[PDB]
Structure 1
Amino acid sequence: LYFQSNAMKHTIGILGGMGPAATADMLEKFVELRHASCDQQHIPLIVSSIPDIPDRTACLLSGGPSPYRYLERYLHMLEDAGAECIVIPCNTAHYWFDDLQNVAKARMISILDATLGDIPPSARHVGLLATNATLATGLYQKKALARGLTLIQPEDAGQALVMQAIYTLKRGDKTAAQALLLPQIDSLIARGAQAIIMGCTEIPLIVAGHERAIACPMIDSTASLVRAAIRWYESWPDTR
C-alpha cells in the first residue's frame, strides 16, 4: 500500500562510469563496509554508470570536450530518481565538484576530503598515485597543505607509467596494469612515502591482492568515499 519514497529513504546516488570498473568496485565496497544482517539492511543506492562522459584528462590537459555537461545531466537524473546524497567515484572529476555542488539539490560528499581524513595523522609524507590531470590541476594539493601534508608524486618518467597502468586497467588488463604499477609503488616507498594515496579510482583494482606485500599503508579513495557516504546515511533519525 504505502511506499516510502527514495528521498525519504535517504537514497544515495553514485555518479559513476568513470570508469565503469571503478564504479562496480564502489558498489562492491558499499556491501563490504556496511554492517547488514541481510539484504534488506543494506544501503539504498541508485547508480549511473553511463561511460559516455568525455575523458577527464583529455579535457583538462588537452582542451578536449568537457565532461561537465554530462556530469550535470546524470547528477540531475539521480536526483530525479530520488537520490538525496551524491558520490562520484572519480577523483579527476572533482575538478568540477564545486560547480556541480552549485547546481545540486542533493548533498554531495567529496572524495578528496574523505580520502585525506582516512590517512593516519602520523603520516606526514605521503605518495600520490593519480591521473595526470588530478596532479596537474592540483586537486589534492590545496587540501593536503591544509592538513600539513607533503605529497610525493612520481617523477615524470614514472608518472607516465602510472598513467599507462591506469589506462591498461581501463582497457581491461589487470595483470599488465599491475606490472606497470607495482614498481612505481616501490619507488615511492623507496623515496620515503609513509603511506600512499590511491588517488585514482582504478588503482585499488590494480593493487588488489598485492597489498599484503606492500611495505606501507595504501589509502583507498573509493573506500574512503563509501565510508563517508555510509556515515551520512547512518546519521538520520530513522537510521541512527
Structure 2
Amino acid sequence: MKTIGLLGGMSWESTIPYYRLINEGIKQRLGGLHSAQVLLHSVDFHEIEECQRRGEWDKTGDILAEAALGLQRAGAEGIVLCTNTMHKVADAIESRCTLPFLHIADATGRAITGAGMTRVALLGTRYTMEQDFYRGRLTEQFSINCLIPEADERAKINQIIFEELCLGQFTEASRAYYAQVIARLAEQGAQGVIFGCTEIGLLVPEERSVLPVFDTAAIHAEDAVAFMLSLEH
C-alpha cells in the first residue's frame, strides 16, 4: 500500500475520524490485523485559525506546504489536507510538494455527481460558504451549485464551529439549529447537504438531517483509502 500523509489538527477533533476511517478501510480490504500506513503532521490550530481571522492566508500556505514537504521526507506518497477551509491555500501545497494532492472538493464532487445531484446546500466555515475557492471548484469541475445559509445563519454556524465543535462541545441546541438550517435550505430545492466543515459530522447525525448528507471528512477518507490501494485511483 501507499503511505498517506495527513495534514491535520484543524481541528484535531476532526483528524480522529480521518485516522479511524482510513484504518477501518484498510482493515476491510486487506483483512486480519492489517492497518493503514499513515504519516500525520498535526499543527497547533491556534496559529492556523488566528491567521484565518487576520486574512494571513499566505502564512498558512507556508505552514502547510512545509508540513507536506516534511511528510514527503518521511515517506509520504500522497497528501490529504484534513480541512475544507484550508483548501483555500491548496495551490501553495500543490506547487511546492510533488506528491499527489487528493483535493477534498474533488472527492466530494465525485460523490455528489454519483448521486445525480446538481443543487446542494453547503454548510461550513464562513470562508468556505461565502468565498469562491470551494464553490467555484464544484461549479467549474462538476457543474454543481451550492446554496448557502442567510447571513445571520452563517454567523451562527461559524460561531458554533469555532467556539464549540473545535473545543469538543456538541450541544443539542446547536444540533437543532443546524438541523433547522438544513430543513430551510431543503425548502429551497437543495437536493442534499454538504457537511463542508469536517467537524460538522461530529455534531449532526445523519438522522437529524432532512437532506441526504455528504460528509466531506468521510468521503475524503475513502478517497485516501482508494489512493493507498490503487483502486478507483
TM-score (ref. length: structure 2): 0.87
TM alignment of 1:151-190, pairs within 5 A: 151-167=146-162, 168-176=164-172, 177-190=174-187
Q: What is the aligned partner in structure 1 of residue 83 from structure 2?
A: 90
Is 1:235 aligned to 2:230, yes or no? yes
CA distance in 2: counterparts of 1:112 and 1:80, whole angstroms: 26
Q: Which residue of 2 aligns with 1:69?
A: 62
**Unpaired stretches in structure 2, ≥5 consecutive residues:** none
Whether contact under 8 Å (2:128, 2:134) holds in the other structure is yes
> Aligned-pair distance for 1:100?
0.8
SS in 1 for 2:47: coil
SS across alignment from 2:171? helix
Q: Relative to total residues, which structure has the larger helix share, 1 or 2?
A: 2
Distance 2:158 2:125 in 1: 6
Aligned to 2:117: 123
Tell me, what secondary structure is at the counterpart of 1:71?
helix
2:67 and 2:82 mapped to 1: Cα distance?
A: 14
Q: Which residue of 2 aligns with 1:6?
A: none
Shift in Å, 1:122: 2.2
Task: Indicate conservation of the 8 Å contact 1:194/1:216, yes or no.
Answer: yes
Matches of 1:169 and 1:230, distance apart in 2: 26
Q: Distance in 1 between matches of 2:15 and 2:106?
A: 19
Q: Size of the alignment, in residue pairs? A: 225
| Alignment check: 8 A CA contact 1:61 1:133 kept | no
CA–CA separation in structure 2 for the residues paired with 1:136 and 1:213: 24
Structure 1 outlier segments of 4+, above 4 Å: none
Equivalent residue, structure 2, for 1:55: 48
The percent of aligned pairs where both chains have the same amino acid is 28
Measured in 2, the distance between the counterparts of 1:175 and 1:32 equals 27
1:194 to 191, 194, 206: 191
Specify the alignment match of 2:139 in structure 1. 145
Query: How far apart, in 1, do the equivalents of 2:77 and 2:153 lie?
Result: 40
Report deviation, 1:61: 5.5
The gaps in structure 1 that reach 5 residues or longer are 1-8
Q: How does 1:37-56 map to 2 (within 5 A)?
A: 37-40=31-34, 42-52=35-45, 54-56=47-49
Give TM-score scaled by structure 1 length. Answer: 0.85
The two structures, once aligned, show a CA RMSD in angstroms of: 2.1
- Equivalent residues of 1:111, 1:221 under 8 A apart: yes
Separation in structure 2 between the aligned mates of residue 62 and residue 180 of structure 1, nearest angstrom: 27
> Which of 2, 5, 15 is the matching residue for 2:7?
15
- 1:113 corresponds, among 103, 106, 111, to 106
Computing the radius of gyration from Cα coordinates, the structure with the larger value is: 1
Asked whether the 8 Å contact 2:182–2:210 carries over to 1, the reply is: no
